[PDB]
Amino acid sequence: SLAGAPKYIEHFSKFSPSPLSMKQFLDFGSSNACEKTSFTFLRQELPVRLANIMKEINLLPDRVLSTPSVQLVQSWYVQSLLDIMEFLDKDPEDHRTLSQFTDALVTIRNRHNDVVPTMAQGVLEYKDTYGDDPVSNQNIQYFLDRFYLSRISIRMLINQHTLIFDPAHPKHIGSIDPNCNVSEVVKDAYDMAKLLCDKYYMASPDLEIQEINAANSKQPIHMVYVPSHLYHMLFELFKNAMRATVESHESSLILPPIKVMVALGEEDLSIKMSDRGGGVPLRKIERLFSYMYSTGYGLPISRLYAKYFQGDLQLFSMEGFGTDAVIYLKALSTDSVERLPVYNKSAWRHYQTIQEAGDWCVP
Amino acid sequence: SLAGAPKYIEHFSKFSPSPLSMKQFLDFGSSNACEKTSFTFLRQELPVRLANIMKEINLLPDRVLSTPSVQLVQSWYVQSLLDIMEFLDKDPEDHRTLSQFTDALVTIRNRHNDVVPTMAQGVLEYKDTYGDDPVSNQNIQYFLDRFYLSRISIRMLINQHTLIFDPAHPKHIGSIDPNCNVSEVVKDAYDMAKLLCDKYYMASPDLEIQEINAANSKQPIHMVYVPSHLYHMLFELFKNAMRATVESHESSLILPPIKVMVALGEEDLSIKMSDRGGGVPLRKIERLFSYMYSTGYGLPISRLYAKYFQGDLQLFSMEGFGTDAVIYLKALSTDSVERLPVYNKSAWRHYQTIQEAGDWCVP
Ligand SMILES: O=C(c1ccc(O)cc1O)N1Cc2ccccc2C1
Ligand SMILES: O=C(c1ccc(O)cc1O)N1Cc2ccccc2C1
């Protein structure tokens, strides 16, 4: 009773995703009027976001697309798109439409739960089956950043709808905390990382937090943010900083602490995590964000969470000494706008590359 | 009596520049046998390096190429190439050939002395005449990085030859110090920057230096390097750090110090300069390396010096707090290999861009 998936994919891929600001997410209410609006918005926007990324999947090297795990993920996206197409002709005024829609969104979220490791298995299958090559590798890197950021954005839309229209923190708006205390999230991530570090090494570095509230030096630093995303990024950073610290201090009973600075400026809210874990040579920094070498997507996915609301996550090491990691976030909810990949000529062209000598000299 | 310049440009642009390692520069002696070798090497290599970059000049937008200052720089390169062509059929066994060659290299160096600000005037002429556009701007950025790095490499070849074969430091090999004490260069750059800061602000931050010699904690850190290049980079970084510190502390008599860490690892020699000058929002970081916004090429040219021997110069700020700048150098002379742009299909393709909507969404 539905059209074939390609007809829907072609239709919806013509549209650009519509990025929302944290402010817009936050200003969305919980009434039936609001639920109907959410429904009518998402039955267009989710297909747009699904179709856009599905079109890019098809630009992957034949070698990568031919893998069973990539084909499996594709099949999930197809079914999720079709699940939403069932709602195109349904009446929002009918409460049953709305409840059925929420049920379908939950089903989609569950279906896609294992997307990250499944795609990673696809990358492994490509390497095992064909051997890796640098052109394919570059395409995979570009694609996966966009694919995973797209997924984060779809999960955000779904979580907002299901949380609001179907509880530990009643002050939250869906998954958003309008008054997220950054240092408390830092402490939560540290605590969980410490449990793991203590388990394996029977020791862990202490934590020191310093806040710099430039405009209001006395005031504890808060922001509008999705605490789970911030936690994810900090937990990954602590795990790396702790492991470095303990492993570079095999002989020591005294471990240097991990120092976190939370700075609030006019435009940025920046969080720096500094360790004395001996560092990494610059040559090896890029590999930390590579899906290929990491095939352990902790750091690249963490950086995508940062980029999702127009921030970033950057690493700067000093080999022989230690490493600084910085999460850059927008301080203002109005500047915190979804960063969404779009399928267009620019994106298509970016794939169209081939093997050749680079523009820099080798001996 | 010479062929027209285009014939020579086409001939030599077919070759790739030949990158030398710091080790190779260093192992070059000062005998007539060595001078003849230097001559026969440079009468091929300098034309190769000149031709390669001249070919790329021609890939600039018509708008930029049409400017008088860019045309002037082009004319210098043409004459310098022709100056060397006069030596193609000369006998290296003849001492007069060798002395004349050194004279010609000096003349070329002098001719090109003002290349950096002259090209900057070209960029200004393009903006004034036509107005700037983002496509042209991207092309200019890509080109200038390569153009200025090429120039650094040509100046290195010329200085090595004229210094060795025609004195404050007899232990130096041309411009190279085989035992450069990094902290002494840091202090020299600080001293000169302080003179300037004191002149304008009547105050300057103090300096603190810490060394971390990972493998040999007692030993002062030395390396094989060109001290003038290291000085250039540090002087630029101190000027920025000092200005930030004083300007962000208008009301204070007490200024936070600039802290420098020099770390020696297995592969990297890293120099971090940390200030509490209030920082810069992330959005504005890229502009610090832009030739367009800086049209003040201090930072981008400094980063090219770092990149020239396979290093880098990176900035990470915390808005509301201060800024860290890190110079990454190779610790080993064998890893310190010239990074040279090459004119090839890859480079040519990189220019071939056009106006269009990007691969990321805007609201
Ligand atoms: O320098 C880092 C590092 C990387 C990323 C990061 O976020 C923080 C960090 O300290 N590591 C060196 C090292 C040695 C042994 C084991 C793990 C690690 C990680
Ligand atoms: O944060 C920096 C900075 C940039 C680059 C750098 O290397 C070191 C730095 O501290 N600045 C802020 C500011 C305010 C007023 C005047 C100048 C400056 C430069």
Coordinates of N, CA and C in Angstrom, one line a residue, chain B residues 18 31 35 70 81-82 104 126 139 166 169 171 193 206 215 220 249 273 282 296 320 326 330 344 352 360:
Chain B
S18 N 62.9 19.0 -5.0 CA 63.5 17.9 -4.3 C 63.7 18.4 -2.9
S31 N 84.0 23.1 0.8 CA 85.1 23.0 -0.1 C 84.7 23.4 -1.5
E35 N 81.4 23.3 -3.2 CA 80.8 24.5 -3.9 C 80.4 24.2 -5.3
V70 N 50.7 42.0 -8.0 CA 50.9 40.6 -8.3 C 51.7 40.5 -9.6
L81 N 64.5 33.8 -12.6 CA 64.7 32.5 -13.4 C 65.6 32.7 -14.5
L82 N 65.5 33.8 -15.3 CA 66.4 34.1 -16.4 C 67.8 34.3 -15.9
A104 N 74.9 36.4 -8.3 CA 73.6 36.4 -8.8 C 72.5 35.9 -7.8
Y126 N 43.1 43.8 -5.3 CA 41.9 42.9 -5.7 C 40.7 43.3 -5.0
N139 N 40.7 30.6 -2.9 CA 41.8 30.4 -3.8 C 43.1 31.1 -3.4
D166 N 80.4 32.1 1.2 CA 80.8 33.5 1.3 C 80.5 34.1 2.7
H169 N 78.7 33.2 14.4 CA 78.7 31.8 14.8 C 79.3 30.9 13.8
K171 N 80.2 28.0 14.3 CA 79.7 26.6 14.5 C 78.4 26.4 13.7
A193 N 60.3 41.4 22.2 CA 58.8 41.7 22.3 C 58.6 42.6 23.5
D206 N 55.8 39.2 32.8 CA 57.0 38.5 33.0 C 57.0 37.2 32.2
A215 N 63.2 12.1 28.2 CA 64.1 11.0 28.3 C 65.3 11.4 29.2
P220 N 69.4 20.3 29.5 CA 68.9 21.4 28.8 C 68.5 21.0 27.3
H249 N 43.9 43.8 30.8 CA 44.2 44.1 32.2 C 44.4 45.6 32.4
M273 N 53.1 28.4 24.5 CA 53.1 29.7 25.2 C 51.7 30.0 25.7
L282 N 36.0 31.1 19.6 CA 36.5 30.1 18.6 C 36.2 30.6 17.2
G296 N 49.8 42.4 8.3 CA 49.6 41.6 9.5 C 49.6 40.1 9.2
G320 N 37.4 34.5 27.6 CA 37.2 34.9 29.0 C 38.4 34.6 29.9
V326 N 50.9 26.7 20.4 CA 51.9 25.6 20.5 C 52.7 25.6 19.1
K330 N 59.9 19.0 14.7 CA 60.4 17.6 14.8 C 61.7 17.6 15.7
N344 N 51.2 20.1 -9.7 CA 50.7 18.9 -10.4 C 49.2 18.9 -10.5
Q352 N 40.4 24.5 -9.2 CA 39.2 24.5 -10.0 C 37.9 24.4 -9.2
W360 N 26.7 21.6 4.1 CA 26.1 21.7 5.4 C 24.9 22.7 5.4

